[PDB]
Amino acid sequence: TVPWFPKKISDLDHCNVYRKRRKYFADLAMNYKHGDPIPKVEFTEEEIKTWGTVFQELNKLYPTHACREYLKNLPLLSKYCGYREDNIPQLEDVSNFLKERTGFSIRPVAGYLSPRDFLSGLAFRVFHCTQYVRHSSDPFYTPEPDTCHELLGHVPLLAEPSFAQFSQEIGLASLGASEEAVQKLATCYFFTVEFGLCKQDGQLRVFGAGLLSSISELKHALSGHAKVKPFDPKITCKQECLITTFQDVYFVSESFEDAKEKMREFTKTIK
Numbered sequence: 174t175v176p177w178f179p180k181k182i183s184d185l186d187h188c189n190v191y192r193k194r195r196k197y198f199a200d201l202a203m204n205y206k207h208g209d210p211i212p213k214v215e216f217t218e219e220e221i222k223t224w225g226t227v228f229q230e231l232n233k234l235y236p237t238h239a240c241r242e243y244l245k246n247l248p249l250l251s252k253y254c255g256y257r258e259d260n261i262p263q264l265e266d267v268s269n270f271l272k273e274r275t276g277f278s279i280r281p282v283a284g285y286l287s288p289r290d291f292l293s294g295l296a297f298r299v300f301h302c303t304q305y306v307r308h309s310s311d312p313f314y315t316p317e318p319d320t321c322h323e324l325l326g327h328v329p330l331l332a333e334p335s336f337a338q339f340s341q342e343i344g345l346a347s348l349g350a351s352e353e354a355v356q357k358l359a360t361c362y363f364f365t366v367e368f369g370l371c372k373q374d375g376q377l378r379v380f381g382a383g384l385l386s387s388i389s390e391l392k393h394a395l396s397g398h399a400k401v402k403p404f405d406p407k408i409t410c411k412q413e414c415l416i417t418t419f420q421d422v423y424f425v426s427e428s429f430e431d432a433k434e435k436m437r438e439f440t441k442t443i444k
């Protein structure tokens with residue numbers, strides 16, 4: 174039997190200091206329903222400092238590390254959505270920017286959704302995003318997603334039509350699929366959207382969001398010390414997704430158009 178899956182965007186409704194603060198964010202996400210403006214947050218001074226460190230250090234790296242599509246959209250976000258060292262962008266603002274650019278929108282989320290539920294969001298061009306800020310003790314890498322990761326890792330590529338299409342298609346393929354198919358698609362997502370490298374004018378560049386928000390892993394990924402294989406869905410889908418550490422291997426796509434084509438061939442075989 175086919176599992177429940179959303180048929181319209183609203184069906185996604187059916188999917189000590191620091192701890193106290195995290196509960197505040199978790200409630201904002203839990204109370205949200207489709208159609209609501211995403212609640213705006215007044216960030217603390219410490220939170221803004223953490224953002225500023227992350228933002229300043231990553232922006233020194235992007236020109237030499239990030240793919241061209243990332244770099245194209247990054248300045249648009251400083252102009253329209255308040256991306257600056259001294260200001261944490263709001264999810265509602267970013268959501269409205271994306272809706273105009275590619276039809277993508279944001280929903281706040283408290284922590285992880287299942288891979289099935291997360292991917293189902295992408296089918297409607299909805300990206301579930303956290304709103305809290307990583308703990309100030311390690312700005313350079315965090316093992317759980319935070320708003321810095323969403324805003325600097327994901328958003329600039331969600332604003333690119335080719336990438337938005339690629340992402341949506343992973344979601345669309347997942348809807349009502351078998352457990353095994355969802356796992357394979359989630360793994361493909363992990364090694365493209367989350368931790369992908371691509372080749373542009375012969376150089377290795379970064380498009381993975383998890384790399385683009387981690388000062389330390391971004392540098393590691395292009396350092397020459399990392400293992401690197403071609404993106405090939407039938408092989409890549411078998412690779413373990415790790416969380417404690419830097420990735421043991423990265424996959425290299427040729428372009429967003431090519432990765433999209435490879436996923437189209439692949440998803441035929443898992444229907």
Ligand SMILES: CS(=O)(=O)c1cccc(-c2cc(Cl)ccc2[C@@H](Oc2cc(N3CCC4(CC3)CN[C@H](C(=O)O)C4)nc(N)n2)C(F)(F)F)c1
Nearest residue numbers: 285288291314315316317318322359383386387414415416
């Ligand atoms: C999106 S999906 O639903 O298709 C999917 C695919 C594969 C696995 C999972 C999944 C699901 C659950 Cl319920 C729990 C955990 C995971 C995976 O965890 C993560 C962590 C994850 N982070 C964690 C946080 C950083 C960024 C990336 C790492 N450093 C960054 C930084 O410092 O800024 C932030 N990103 C993904 N996609 N999955 C795990 F299996 F553990 F690796 C989800």
Ligand SMILES: [Fe+3]
Nearest residue numbers: 318367382383
């Ligand atoms: Fe992510």
